[PDB]
Amino acid sequence: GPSVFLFPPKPKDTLMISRTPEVTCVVVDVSHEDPEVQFKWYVDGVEVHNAKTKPREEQFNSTFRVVSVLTVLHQDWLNGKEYKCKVSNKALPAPIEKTISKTKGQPREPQVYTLPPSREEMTKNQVSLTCLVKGFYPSDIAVEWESSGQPENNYNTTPPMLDSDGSFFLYSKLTVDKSRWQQGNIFSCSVMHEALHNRFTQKSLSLS
Amino acid sequence: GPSVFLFPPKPKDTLMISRTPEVTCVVVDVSHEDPEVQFKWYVDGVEVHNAKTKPREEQFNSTFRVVSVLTVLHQDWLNGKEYKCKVSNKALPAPIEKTISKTKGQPREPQVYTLPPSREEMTKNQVSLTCLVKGFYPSDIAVEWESSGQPENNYNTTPPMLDSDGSFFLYSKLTVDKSRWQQGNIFSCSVMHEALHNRFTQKSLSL
Amino acid sequence: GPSVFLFPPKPKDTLMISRTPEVTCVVVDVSHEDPEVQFKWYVDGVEVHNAKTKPREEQFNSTFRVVSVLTVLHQDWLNGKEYKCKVSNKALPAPIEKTISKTKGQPREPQVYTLPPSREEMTKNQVSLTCLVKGFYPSDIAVEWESSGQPENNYNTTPPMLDSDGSFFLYSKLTVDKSRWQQGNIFSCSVMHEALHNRFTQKSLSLS
């Protein structure tokens, strides 16, 4: 029978009110004999009607994929409210229900560090700048290499590896041509996260 | 039916002078009705028998996994010699051949960069010294913080991501108490790689 | 009857992978009645077939000299693996076997010191600079007077003479006309050795 997957909204969408966060319920392996899929949506057990079902799409295995989206309230998502998707399809023995909420775990304020390039790296054409974002939880975050609060041309961001502190860390590799760094630009790495003051922080960088 | 995968030697095997690299040919999904798998190995198309076929292994899907390995020489691997694995099995429609050599693409001498800790990082008890390794190609790499050209060890290593220069980069997160950085330790970092002098170069850092 | 000599590869060839190190088996005093010499080669007792026999050459004593060369692996030579040459000739009562490996003895990191010329030597046309390479063992080494890592015009290298520390030392006499030194050029003695990090170290020198 078909299977159902439920995706969270983008972190920024949950943190920026001028944005709309939504959860996405994806149903795969729906059969052609019974392609109709009913979606019912609930926020912490209360049915809401601002959810919408996306068009059904046939998959490589000759089954249908059916998706429903529920708009979620900023307050509901950031406070960790639970959003339930109910999926019904005749190729299912029982309706499938899936719940999602703000990515599980206690929020942690990201510690944003901007590691300068190696002194020996000035002999090379292009130097790397290194936004260490550590001590942040959940992975719902935005990490924002910048100059003086204005995002940068080129950063090659590592995965959220776990740091020496049990948080996620990543490096955003703000890789900059030698003149940019050597001249002492005030780069900055900003980071957007629920646990930050402003849900948004800015930690600068310059030849130092 | 069966599938064959041919793996290069471990990067440090190809890159550490003291090591002997070998290539490993893995065959999965060999059937039980015809479990016999023939491995023939070739170096630059010439069949060799210093290659060895590993034991057949039953997968949970009621198939067999069969593996053969061929030792490769430092200069041979680094000079791009081609090592070919020929796999035959009756559950295959035809024999499957795979060849492996130094990972194809322009080699680049790794630029080894003990990046200093962030000024912003001095607020914490511990700071990260990052041995950026950039400008290297292939990903066939080994990375190694150091001090005075001798190793350091609380380095994380990121993946060989792509760098802006069209190479791989990775960051080697040595992470250390703030005092070590502020005290002006002569750290270093080595990187072992085919394009390097002695395939191994070391770059130092200190405050 | 004939005699056999086995020579090691050049140190640099063993330390630079982009180089190929080889061992050379030399057979002298081979007779003219039986000039044919068979060479068999083994690496740590395992016969290899990437060895080659050089052309036979008649010596001053009216005997033949026959030579065989075996390419050696970087790993094999630097790890001290043993390479055996088997020599057969009818003018021999029994085959002659000779083994060679990385020059015998415990590796020691070369200490590279660049001694400036005498203060009184500026009164003379041309001053000497003194690359003291000490604490290095074995003699498999490359010693490299330079400027800033780029080899120099004129160093009169003094022998591997044993030092106060039981290593070989040598000077390399980077003799330089007075203006080069007096102006404070960053000369440099580098030194390549198995015991060095990178098998290769670089030391500056300047008027100091």
Residue numbers in the entry:
A (entry chain B), C (entry chain D): 288 to 495
B (entry chain A): 288 to 494
Which statements did the authors publish about this structure?
However, in tomograms of IgG3 bound to antigenic liposomes, elevated platforms 22 ± 3.5 nm (SD, n = 100) above and parallel to the liposome surface were visible above the Fab domains. IgG3-Fc platforms are therefore an additional 11 nm further from the antigenic membrane than for IgG1, which is possible due to the long hinge of IgG3 adopting an extended conformation. These platforms were often observed above ordered, striated IgG3-Fab arrays; from a total of 1193 elevated platforms, 525 were above ordered, striated Fab domains, with the remainder above disordered density. To determine whether these platforms represented hexameric IgG3-Fc domains, we performed subtomogram averaging and 3D classification of all 1193 particles, which yielded a hexagonal Fc platform. This Fc geometry is in keeping with previous data of C1-bound IgG1 platforms, although these hexagonal Fc platforms have not been previously observed for non-mutated or antigen-bound antibodies in the absence of the C1 complex. Our data did not resolve the hinge regions and so, to yield a complete model of the IgG3 hexamers, we modelled the hinge as a semi-rigid helix which spanned the ~11 nm between the Fc-hexamer and Fab domains. The Fc platform was rotated to minimise the average hinge length between the respective Fc and Fab domains, yielding the complete hexameric IgG3 structure in Fig. 2b. The elevated platforms and divalent binding are therefore both enabled by the flexibility of IgG3-hinge region compared to IgG1. We observed that IgG3 formed Fc platforms ~22 nm ± 3.5 nm (SD, n = 100) above the liposome surface, with the hinge adopting an extended conformation. Our cryoEM model of hexameric IgG3 Fc platforms revealed the location of K326 on the periphery of the Fc domain, within the CH2 dimers.
